[PDB]
Amino acid sequence: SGKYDPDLGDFKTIEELEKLKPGEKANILLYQGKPVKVVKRKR
Amino acid sequence: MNINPYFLFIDVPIQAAISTTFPYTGVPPYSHGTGTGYTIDTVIRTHEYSNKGKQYISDVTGCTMVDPTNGPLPEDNEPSAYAQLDCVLEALDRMDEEHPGLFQAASQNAMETLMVTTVDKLTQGRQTFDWTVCRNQPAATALNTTITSFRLNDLNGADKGGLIPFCQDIIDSLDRPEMTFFSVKNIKKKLPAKNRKGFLIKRIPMKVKDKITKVEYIKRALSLNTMRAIATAGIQIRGFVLVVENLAKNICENLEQSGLPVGGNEKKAKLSNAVAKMLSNCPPGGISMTVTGDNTKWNECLNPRIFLAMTERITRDSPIWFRDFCSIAPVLFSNKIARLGKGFMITSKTKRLKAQIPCPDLFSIPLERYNEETRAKLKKLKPFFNEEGTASLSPGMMMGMFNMLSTVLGVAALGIKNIGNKEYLWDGLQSSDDFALFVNAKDEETCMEGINDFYRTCKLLGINMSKKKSYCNETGMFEFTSMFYRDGFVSNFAMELPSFGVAGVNESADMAIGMTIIKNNMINNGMGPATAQTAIQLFIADYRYTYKCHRGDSKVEGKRMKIIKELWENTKGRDGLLVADGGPNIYNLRNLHIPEIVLKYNLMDPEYKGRLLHPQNPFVGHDYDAVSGTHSWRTKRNRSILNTDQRNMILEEQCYAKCCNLFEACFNSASYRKPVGQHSMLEAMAHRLRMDARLDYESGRMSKDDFEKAMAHLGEIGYI
Amino acid sequence: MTLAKIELLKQLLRDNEAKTVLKQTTVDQYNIIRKFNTSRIEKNPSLRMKWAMCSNFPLALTKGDMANRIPLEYKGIQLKTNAEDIGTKGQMCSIAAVTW
Amino acid sequence: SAEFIEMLHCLQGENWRQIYHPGGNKLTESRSQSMIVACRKIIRRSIVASNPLELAVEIANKTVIDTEPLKSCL
Amino acid sequence: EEPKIPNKCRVAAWVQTEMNLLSTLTSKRALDLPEIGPDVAPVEHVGS
Amino acid sequence: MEMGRRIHLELRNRTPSDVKELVLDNSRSNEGKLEGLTDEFEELEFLSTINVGLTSIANLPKLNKLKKLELSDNRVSGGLEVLAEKCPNLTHLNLSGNKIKDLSTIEPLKKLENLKSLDLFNCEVTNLNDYRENVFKLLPQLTYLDGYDRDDKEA
Amino acid sequence: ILCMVFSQDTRMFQGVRGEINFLNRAGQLLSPMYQLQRYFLNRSNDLFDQWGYEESPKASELHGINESMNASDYTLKGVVVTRNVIDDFSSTETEKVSIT
């Protein structure tokens, strides 16, 4: 849904991703220097 | 659920369960300190078990001597060193009769090997006690120092090259009234060093000449210094012990009872064969019993005089000169003098002080100032103490120095096979410290009578069986030198495992040495396939860490890893790249004896093959098996001080410090502006000042007057 | 100041011992005294090579056309050194050089 | 045997024994020496699987010794 | 000075807990060993 | 301070059936009990008993609406089967800091089926091999534990 | 270095080699004295090289110090290190001081 936003915080581990709730946006890292911002979906 | 590891023994035989209990076959770091106290205790115990013998005063070294041989027989189960000569001679006679033509052949082979050997053989050994400096030095350095001292004393045995002339010169040097030699003396320092004052104090060594009276050299040669070996012997003893041990090894090799020098699965074969042989000839309906005997104070009870008797009996039909050569070692050991080491340490808590009392001043203070144990030990050691901080020690063997002869004596004890013509027959195996005894009889009562007779017999020969560390059980299960045998199955108690890190030579050499070490561990110590593969994995990990040669396709970063990644990208035959170049490892059990270059040759890129195996590459320049390529580089091995005389006389003149001070400012203002490469420091200074003046004038720091003045002075220097 | 250093060098040259030591002893020999002054030999070969590899130029290098064929720098990475060495009496090369 | 000691690390152990045979320039029965081993593997693949017949014939029909089907060589 | 011989102590209950816990399976591993060449001989297969 | 004072403060001198939660913390108890809570209580959802010195569970009103209960820092060591006969509707159980000897103490929770989370911290039973697995197969009804069943959610 | 800058010695001025346009964390241009202070402290080996050297203080205790701060002879022009105790800062009057 977006791009790297240091304000939202650092990258979130799979442990936090799995316990996340729908409608909440998080940040992940593909590889060194290419972060991305994602959002959970019900579907 | 509280775990109980010992419960494993319920479901597994203990022989397998306790396999490889100690990963280390060497020595731990936390072992009870072997200092002056330990050696004092050792000498005390050696003299304690033989105090009923004949005590006299040596007329050569003027030291107390104890001779227990042919002494009163023991009346108690305590350890005894009183070995009757007649029993030993009879045992040797029985061994010779059983093995006709054995002693003669072994003595002949030993004398021939001695004739063909060379002095250089003495350099293959552990730390040796150098007498010129009275310390522990490498074998080569000790031999060189002894040779130099002999040359100074008109003794040139090493010149002839043979070992016989060297030993002849040793025994002749034992006769010179005054012995002159070289020694190293340290003197303090006054040369500059930049910490906060350009001045530091250290120690510099110099070579000096020192002379010693006859008795002093005699005592020094017999001295045994201490660093599970307890002491080391100098060079005057090494050749004779070498010859005697070669003789004993020749005898042992043909003794079926001897457990040496067997190594590898041959040990298992010998164990199983001995068990099978003993069971086969068991009396119909009889009982076979096995004792995993151990010997307490083995080397604190064997007497050098008994070894001399054994050597004389063995070489009864041999040239007289060889007989004397063999006898020279036991007589030297029979007069051994122990060195007590550094000394003790005494402290005062109230004033927060401590001091070190060296061995010569051991008794210089009242005994009340030593703790209880040291007080008692010194009280007991007083009679056997010399004024030069050394202890006379006639008996004992201070751990392994005649291990082969010890095994021969044990085999002789095992060869009697009967006493009183009773209904029991004994035999077994023995390797220089431990014996397994098999006895066949009718009932266990007769077997134990035979075991008792064997115990008494070995007592008569000075061998003391350990009642507190021995047991008996029906034959089929026992132990022999940390190797448990159980109805065919065989396990090890302690196995040496590969140590962390590479061998420490170079990439290809380190890889080859690691693989050959793993192969040797498999062959000898019996390492299973899975363990060997895991060892290969660990060695590869350590090798990659040490050489920074991770896989080319890995994501690690490093100075060398960029080029490795580029090579991996540019290479087609990625299976043929060496591990040192980030390639894939392909080593496994079937190919642990093949160099990786040979393994990967068929898969290497031809261009990569040419680059790697270039006949003239700048790295290689000018055991294990490998291939000479660009990975056989050599590291800079050049340190210490050379030009010692010139440097010492320069540093002792005066003005060196001023030269250093002038050098420091200019040549440290910049990290590296030195025209190095044998340039005279004055020339480098001249060039540096010329460039500095040029830059100052160009930037305007100096006017033309100062410029010309500086060049005038620089013109006067001679490099402008 | 250049003049101050110049005058100090002349004053030092007035004395014979300083002049002799400066004329004979080379810049290469200057490093040697500092080494034994504050350095000595080590042990534990496994760790010794571990320390050596991390250094800049631990590998000895031969002298010849091939030695000079490889460059001084590569993608911002040094390979060898120009000035002669004392021990090997030749150039010294970095580990990366081999990979190059 | 000179050729057996070199591999001893992989032949004999304390409580195990590996049956290994040497080699060296035994070329001439190439095709045969191939088919047998290939055929062996097929059986090793079929015996474990249920109903080995169809699987064995399938693997045998779809195997080629580098130019030709195994059937022709057999 | 006299030698400080080691004292004498009774059973410590924490060693049992140490053994119990160190033998449990956690959620993380810290072992990453390199690879080995392909296995051909039966002994290599058994070891693998 | 006493359990009665806490009851009065929380209820504020009102009918017992007016609050669905209680906070009995830092309250001294007679021989380690939870007196001051009469059996007349009919509605209760949350409970909190910390530093009460409770040594046993033998006095508790019969209930059918409680879903959470909190016990901590107590020397209680005894069978908890009585909870089934008193209130078999527990969902959150907290025994952090309690004193339980062996696994047998937590056995009687099998008959309870509504329990989903159980807490046992620094307990003598917690320091055992496969305690996590052993408890799980001993209480199949359990859906949560000290916090790491499979993920992390909050009560 | 600080006494050097404060003394306003002509040699210190002639020893400058870079540039003086620095500011503070608040972003202000300082007087040339403090700019020189910051320049010399940042680059200590700027006025030290061209300052000039002076013979060591030949005496019982007076001994020199070189540019590297080691207690080495051939000291800086003027600088002297005495192996004694200098006790200073007497009469701490706390005299009246105004604040702008």
PDB file of N, CA and C in Angstrom, chain B residues 533-600:
ATOM      1  N   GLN B 533      32.255 -37.223   8.942  1.00  0.00           N
ATOM      2  CA  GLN B 533      31.611 -36.235   8.082  1.00  0.00           C
ATOM      3  C   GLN B 533      31.348 -34.938   8.837  1.00  0.00           C
ATOM      4  N   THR B 534      30.913 -35.039  10.092  1.00  0.00           N
ATOM      5  CA  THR B 534      30.711 -33.834  10.889  1.00  0.00           C
ATOM      6  C   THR B 534      32.031 -33.117  11.140  1.00  0.00           C
ATOM      7  N   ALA B 535      33.111 -33.874  11.341  1.00  0.00           N
ATOM      8  CA  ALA B 535      34.424 -33.258  11.481  1.00  0.00           C
ATOM      9  C   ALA B 535      34.823 -32.537  10.203  1.00  0.00           C
ATOM     10  N   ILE B 536      34.511 -33.125   9.048  1.00  0.00           N
ATOM     11  CA  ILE B 536      34.781 -32.455   7.778  1.00  0.00           C
ATOM     12  C   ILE B 536      34.017 -31.141   7.709  1.00  0.00           C
ATOM     13  N   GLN B 537      32.743 -31.168   8.104  1.00  0.00           N
ATOM     14  CA  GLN B 537      31.936 -29.952   8.082  1.00  0.00           C
ATOM     15  C   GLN B 537      32.537 -28.878   8.984  1.00  0.00           C
ATOM     16  N   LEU B 538      32.909 -29.258  10.208  1.00  0.00           N
ATOM     17  CA  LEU B 538      33.480 -28.290  11.138  1.00  0.00           C
ATOM     18  C   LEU B 538      34.796 -27.735  10.613  1.00  0.00           C
ATOM     19  N   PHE B 539      35.635 -28.595  10.033  1.00  0.00           N
ATOM     20  CA  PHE B 539      36.903 -28.123   9.493  1.00  0.00           C
ATOM     21  C   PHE B 539      36.680 -27.162   8.337  1.00  0.00           C
ATOM     22  N   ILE B 540      35.699 -27.445   7.480  1.00  0.00           N
ATOM     23  CA  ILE B 540      35.400 -26.531   6.382  1.00  0.00           C
ATOM     24  C   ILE B 540      34.942 -25.187   6.928  1.00  0.00           C
ATOM     25  N   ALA B 541      34.084 -25.205   7.949  1.00  0.00           N
ATOM     26  CA  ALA B 541      33.627 -23.953   8.544  1.00  0.00           C
ATOM     27  C   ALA B 541      34.801 -23.149   9.089  1.00  0.00           C
ATOM     28  N   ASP B 542      35.673 -23.801   9.860  1.00  0.00           N
ATOM     29  CA  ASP B 542      36.817 -23.102  10.440  1.00  0.00           C
ATOM     30  C   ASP B 542      37.750 -22.584   9.355  1.00  0.00           C
ATOM     31  N   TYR B 543      37.969 -23.382   8.312  1.00  0.00           N
ATOM     32  CA  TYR B 543      38.830 -22.978   7.207  1.00  0.00           C
ATOM     33  C   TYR B 543      38.282 -21.739   6.512  1.00  0.00           C
ATOM     34  N   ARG B 544      36.981 -21.737   6.220  1.00  0.00           N
ATOM     35  CA  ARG B 544      36.373 -20.584   5.570  1.00  0.00           C
ATOM     36  C   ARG B 544      36.456 -19.351   6.459  1.00  0.00           C
ATOM     37  N   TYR B 545      36.218 -19.515   7.762  1.00  0.00           N
ATOM     38  CA  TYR B 545      36.338 -18.377   8.667  1.00  0.00           C
ATOM     39  C   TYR B 545      37.762 -17.836   8.677  1.00  0.00           C
ATOM     40  N   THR B 546      38.754 -18.725   8.736  1.00  0.00           N
ATOM     41  CA  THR B 546      40.139 -18.279   8.857  1.00  0.00           C
ATOM     42  C   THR B 546      40.615 -17.587   7.588  1.00  0.00           C
ATOM     43  N   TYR B 547      40.293 -18.143   6.422  1.00  0.00           N
ATOM     44  CA  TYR B 547      40.786 -17.613   5.158  1.00  0.00           C
ATOM     45  C   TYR B 547      39.810 -16.659   4.484  1.00  0.00           C
ATOM     46  N   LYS B 548      38.666 -16.378   5.105  1.00  0.00           N
ATOM     47  CA  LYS B 548      37.689 -15.447   4.546  1.00  0.00           C
ATOM     48  C   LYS B 548      37.330 -15.832   3.114  1.00  0.00           C
ATOM     49  N   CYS B 549      37.134 -17.130   2.889  1.00  0.00           N
ATOM     50  CA  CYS B 549      36.859 -17.644   1.553  1.00  0.00           C
ATOM     51  C   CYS B 549      35.486 -18.298   1.501  1.00  0.00           C
ATOM     52  N   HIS B 550      34.473 -17.601   2.007  1.00  0.00           N
ATOM     53  CA  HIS B 550      33.119 -18.125   1.987  1.00  0.00           C
ATOM     54  C   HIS B 550      32.681 -18.413   0.551  1.00  0.00           C
ATOM     55  N   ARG B 551      31.540 -19.087   0.432  1.00  0.00           N
ATOM     56  CA  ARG B 551      31.041 -19.490  -0.874  1.00  0.00           C
ATOM     57  C   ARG B 551      30.875 -18.283  -1.786  1.00  0.00           C
ATOM     58  N   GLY B 552      31.183 -18.478  -3.069  1.00  0.00           N
ATOM     59  CA  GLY B 552      31.054 -17.393  -4.025  1.00  0.00           C
ATOM     60  C   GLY B 552      29.630 -16.902  -4.177  1.00  0.00           C
ATOM     61  N   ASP B 553      28.655 -17.788  -3.997  1.00  0.00           N
ATOM     62  CA  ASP B 553      27.248 -17.427  -4.108  1.00  0.00           C
ATOM     63  C   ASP B 553      26.639 -17.002  -2.778  1.00  0.00           C
ATOM     64  N   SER B 554      27.430 -16.940  -1.708  1.00  0.00           N
ATOM     65  CA  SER B 554      26.931 -16.473  -0.422  1.00  0.00           C
ATOM     66  C   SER B 554      26.691 -14.970  -0.465  1.00  0.00           C
ATOM     67  N   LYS B 555      26.091 -14.424   0.593  1.00  0.00           N
ATOM     68  CA  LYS B 555      25.773 -13.003   0.671  1.00  0.00           C
ATOM     69  C   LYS B 555      26.675 -12.282   1.666  1.00  0.00           C
ATOM     70  N   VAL B 556      27.792 -12.898   2.039  1.00  0.00           N
ATOM     71  CA  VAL B 556      28.721 -12.277   2.973  1.00  0.00           C
ATOM     72  C   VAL B 556      29.550 -11.235   2.236  1.00  0.00           C
ATOM     73  N   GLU B 557      30.101 -10.290   2.993  1.00  0.00           N
ATOM     74  CA  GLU B 557      30.877  -9.189   2.445  1.00  0.00           C
ATOM     75  C   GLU B 557      32.273  -9.194   3.050  1.00  0.00           C
ATOM     76  N   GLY B 558      33.271  -8.942   2.212  1.00  0.00           N
ATOM     77  CA  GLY B 558      34.646  -8.901   2.672  1.00  0.00           C
ATOM     78  C   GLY B 558      35.550  -8.386   1.576  1.00  0.00           C
ATOM     79  N   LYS B 559      36.776  -8.045   1.975  1.00  0.00           N
ATOM     80  CA  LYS B 559      37.740  -7.512   1.020  1.00  0.00           C
ATOM     81  C   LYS B 559      38.036  -8.525  -0.077  1.00  0.00           C
ATOM     82  N   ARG B 560      38.269  -9.780   0.305  1.00  0.00           N
ATOM     83  CA  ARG B 560      38.497 -10.839  -0.668  1.00  0.00           C
ATOM     84  C   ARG B 560      37.203 -11.359  -1.275  1.00  0.00           C
ATOM     85  N   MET B 561      36.064 -11.117  -0.625  1.00  0.00           N
ATOM     86  CA  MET B 561      34.820 -11.740  -1.063  1.00  0.00           C
ATOM     87  C   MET B 561      34.272 -11.092  -2.327  1.00  0.00           C
ATOM     88  N   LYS B 562      34.621  -9.833  -2.590  1.00  0.00           N
ATOM     89  CA  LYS B 562      34.183  -9.196  -3.828  1.00  0.00           C
ATOM     90  C   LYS B 562      34.802  -9.880  -5.042  1.00  0.00           C
ATOM     91  N   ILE B 563      36.115 -10.111  -5.004  1.00  0.00           N
ATOM     92  CA  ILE B 563      36.779 -10.787  -6.114  1.00  0.00           C
ATOM     93  C   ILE B 563      36.282 -12.221  -6.227  1.00  0.00           C
ATOM     94  N   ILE B 564      36.036 -12.871  -5.089  1.00  0.00           N
ATOM     95  CA  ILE B 564      35.513 -14.233  -5.114  1.00  0.00           C
ATOM     96  C   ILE B 564      34.156 -14.258  -5.806  1.00  0.00           C
ATOM     97  N   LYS B 565      33.291 -13.300  -5.469  1.00  0.00           N
ATOM     98  CA  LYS B 565      31.975 -13.241  -6.091  1.00  0.00           C
ATOM     99  C   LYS B 565      32.086 -12.979  -7.586  1.00  0.00           C
ATOM    100  N   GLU B 566      32.996 -12.088  -7.987  1.00  0.00           N
ATOM    101  CA  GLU B 566      33.179 -11.825  -9.411  1.00  0.00           C
ATOM    102  C   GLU B 566      33.653 -13.074 -10.143  1.00  0.00           C
ATOM    103  N   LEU B 567      34.605 -13.802  -9.556  1.00  0.00           N
ATOM    104  CA  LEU B 567      35.087 -15.032 -10.177  1.00  0.00           C
ATOM    105  C   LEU B 567      33.974 -16.065 -10.278  1.00  0.00           C
ATOM    106  N   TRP B 568      33.157 -16.186  -9.230  1.00  0.00           N
ATOM    107  CA  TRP B 568      32.027 -17.102  -9.265  1.00  0.00           C
ATOM    108  C   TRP B 568      31.029 -16.724 -10.349  1.00  0.00           C
ATOM    109  N   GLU B 569      30.766 -15.430 -10.530  1.00  0.00           N
ATOM    110  CA  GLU B 569      29.895 -14.979 -11.606  1.00  0.00           C
ATOM    111  C   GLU B 569      30.474 -15.269 -12.983  1.00  0.00           C
ATOM    112  N   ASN B 570      31.786 -15.107 -13.159  1.00  0.00           N
ATOM    113  CA  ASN B 570      32.409 -15.275 -14.466  1.00  0.00           C
ATOM    114  C   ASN B 570      32.720 -16.725 -14.806  1.00  0.00           C
ATOM    115  N   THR B 571      32.639 -17.633 -13.837  1.00  0.00           N
ATOM    116  CA  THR B 571      33.051 -19.013 -14.057  1.00  0.00           C
ATOM    117  C   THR B 571      31.866 -19.872 -14.479  1.00  0.00           C
ATOM    118  N   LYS B 572      32.108 -20.784 -15.421  1.00  0.00           N
ATOM    119  CA  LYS B 572      31.092 -21.732 -15.864  1.00  0.00           C
ATOM    120  C   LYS B 572      31.119 -23.012 -15.038  1.00  0.00           C
ATOM    121  N   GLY B 573      32.302 -23.591 -14.849  1.00  0.00           N
ATOM    122  CA  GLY B 573      32.436 -24.800 -14.062  1.00  0.00           C
ATOM    123  C   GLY B 573      32.468 -24.509 -12.577  1.00  0.00           C
ATOM    124  N   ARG B 574      31.309 -24.161 -12.015  1.00  0.00           N
ATOM    125  CA  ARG B 574      31.246 -23.764 -10.614  1.00  0.00           C
ATOM    126  C   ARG B 574      31.483 -24.930  -9.666  1.00  0.00           C
ATOM    127  N   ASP B 575      31.323 -26.168 -10.132  1.00  0.00           N
ATOM    128  CA  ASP B 575      31.654 -27.320  -9.306  1.00  0.00           C
ATOM    129  C   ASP B 575      33.154 -27.560  -9.224  1.00  0.00           C
ATOM    130  N   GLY B 576      33.926 -27.018 -10.166  1.00  0.00           N
ATOM    131  CA  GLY B 576      35.362 -27.205 -10.190  1.00  0.00           C
ATOM    132  C   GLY B 576      36.165 -26.186  -9.420  1.00  0.00           C
ATOM    133  N   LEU B 577      35.537 -25.103  -8.974  1.00  0.00           N
ATOM    134  CA  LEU B 577      36.248 -24.098  -8.198  1.00  0.00           C
ATOM    135  C   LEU B 577      36.665 -24.666  -6.849  1.00  0.00           C
ATOM    136  N   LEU B 578      37.870 -24.310  -6.414  1.00  0.00           N
ATOM    137  CA  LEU B 578      38.351 -24.764  -5.121  1.00  0.00           C
ATOM    138  C   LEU B 578      37.592 -24.067  -3.996  1.00  0.00           C
ATOM    139  N   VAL B 579      37.581 -24.713  -2.829  1.00  0.00           N
ATOM    140  CA  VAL B 579      36.915 -24.130  -1.669  1.00  0.00           C
ATOM    141  C   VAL B 579      37.558 -22.800  -1.309  1.00  0.00           C
ATOM    142  N   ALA B 580      38.883 -22.708  -1.439  1.00  0.00           N
ATOM    143  CA  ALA B 580      39.575 -21.461  -1.140  1.00  0.00           C
ATOM    144  C   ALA B 580      39.084 -20.313  -2.009  1.00  0.00           C
ATOM    145  N   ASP B 581      38.501 -20.611  -3.171  1.00  0.00           N
ATOM    146  CA  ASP B 581      37.944 -19.601  -4.061  1.00  0.00           C
ATOM    147  C   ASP B 581      36.424 -19.539  -3.979  1.00  0.00           C
ATOM    148  N   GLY B 582      35.858 -19.865  -2.822  1.00  0.00           N
ATOM    149  CA  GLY B 582      34.424 -19.790  -2.650  1.00  0.00           C
ATOM    150  C   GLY B 582      33.644 -20.862  -3.369  1.00  0.00           C
ATOM    151  N   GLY B 583      34.309 -21.895  -3.873  1.00  0.00           N
ATOM    152  CA  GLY B 583      33.626 -22.961  -4.560  1.00  0.00           C
ATOM    153  C   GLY B 583      32.964 -23.919  -3.598  1.00  0.00           C
ATOM    154  N   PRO B 584      32.269 -24.902  -4.158  1.00  0.00           N
ATOM    155  CA  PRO B 584      31.606 -25.901  -3.320  1.00  0.00           C
ATOM    156  C   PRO B 584      32.565 -27.000  -2.897  1.00  0.00           C
ATOM    157  N   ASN B 585      32.507 -27.345  -1.615  1.00  0.00           N
ATOM    158  CA  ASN B 585      33.271 -28.469  -1.096  1.00  0.00           C
ATOM    159  C   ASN B 585      32.656 -29.779  -1.571  1.00  0.00           C
ATOM    160  N   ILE B 586      33.513 -30.739  -1.917  1.00  0.00           N
ATOM    161  CA  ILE B 586      33.051 -32.020  -2.442  1.00  0.00           C
ATOM    162  C   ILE B 586      33.690 -33.171  -1.677  1.00  0.00           C
ATOM    163  N   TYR B 587      34.417 -32.858  -0.611  1.00  0.00           N
ATOM    164  CA  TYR B 587      35.118 -33.894   0.133  1.00  0.00           C
ATOM    165  C   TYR B 587      34.130 -34.788   0.869  1.00  0.00           C
ATOM    166  N   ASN B 588      34.425 -36.084   0.886  1.00  0.00           N
ATOM    167  CA  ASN B 588      33.643 -37.056   1.636  1.00  0.00           C
ATOM    168  C   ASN B 588      34.556 -38.226   1.980  1.00  0.00           C
ATOM    169  N   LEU B 589      33.977 -39.273   2.573  1.00  0.00           N
ATOM    170  CA  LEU B 589      34.792 -40.370   3.086  1.00  0.00           C
ATOM    171  C   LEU B 589      35.580 -41.054   1.975  1.00  0.00           C
ATOM    172  N   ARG B 590      34.940 -41.314   0.834  1.00  0.00           N
ATOM    173  CA  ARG B 590      35.602 -42.071  -0.221  1.00  0.00           C
ATOM    174  C   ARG B 590      36.785 -41.328  -0.824  1.00  0.00           C
ATOM    175  N   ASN B 591      36.835 -40.006  -0.694  1.00  0.00           N
ATOM    176  CA  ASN B 591      37.875 -39.191  -1.315  1.00  0.00           C
ATOM    177  C   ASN B 591      38.542 -38.295  -0.282  1.00  0.00           C
ATOM    178  N   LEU B 592      38.918 -38.874   0.855  1.00  0.00           N
ATOM    179  CA  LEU B 592      39.662 -38.153   1.878  1.00  0.00           C
ATOM    180  C   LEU B 592      41.168 -38.215   1.665  1.00  0.00           C
ATOM    181  N   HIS B 593      41.634 -38.941   0.648  1.00  0.00           N
ATOM    182  CA  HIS B 593      43.059 -39.090   0.377  1.00  0.00           C
ATOM    183  C   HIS B 593      43.447 -38.527  -0.985  1.00  0.00           C
ATOM    184  N   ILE B 594      42.595 -37.700  -1.584  1.00  0.00           N
ATOM    185  CA  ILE B 594      42.824 -37.139  -2.908  1.00  0.00           C
ATOM    186  C   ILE B 594      42.875 -35.624  -2.769  1.00  0.00           C
ATOM    187  N   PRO B 595      43.916 -34.951  -3.260  1.00  0.00           N
ATOM    188  CA  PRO B 595      43.925 -33.485  -3.208  1.00  0.00           C
ATOM    189  C   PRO B 595      42.755 -32.901  -3.985  1.00  0.00           C
ATOM    190  N   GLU B 596      42.216 -31.791  -3.474  1.00  0.00           N
ATOM    191  CA  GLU B 596      41.035 -31.203  -4.097  1.00  0.00           C
ATOM    192  C   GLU B 596      41.322 -30.741  -5.518  1.00  0.00           C
ATOM    193  N   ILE B 597      42.560 -30.332  -5.801  1.00  0.00           N
ATOM    194  CA  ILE B 597      42.913 -29.953  -7.166  1.00  0.00           C
ATOM    195  C   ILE B 597      42.709 -31.136  -8.102  1.00  0.00           C
ATOM    196  N   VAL B 598      43.204 -32.308  -7.703  1.00  0.00           N
ATOM    197  CA  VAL B 598      43.035 -33.504  -8.520  1.00  0.00           C
ATOM    198  C   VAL B 598      41.564 -33.887  -8.606  1.00  0.00           C
ATOM    199  N   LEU B 599      40.822 -33.713  -7.512  1.00  0.00           N
ATOM    200  CA  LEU B 599      39.405 -34.053  -7.522  1.00  0.00           C
ATOM    201  C   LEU B 599      38.647 -33.214  -8.542  1.00  0.00           C
ATOM    202  N   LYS B 600      38.913 -31.911  -8.572  1.00  0.00           N
ATOM    203  CA  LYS B 600      38.139 -30.974  -9.373  1.00  0.00           C
ATOM    204  C   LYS B 600      38.751 -30.688 -10.738  1.00  0.00           C
TER     205      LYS B 600
END
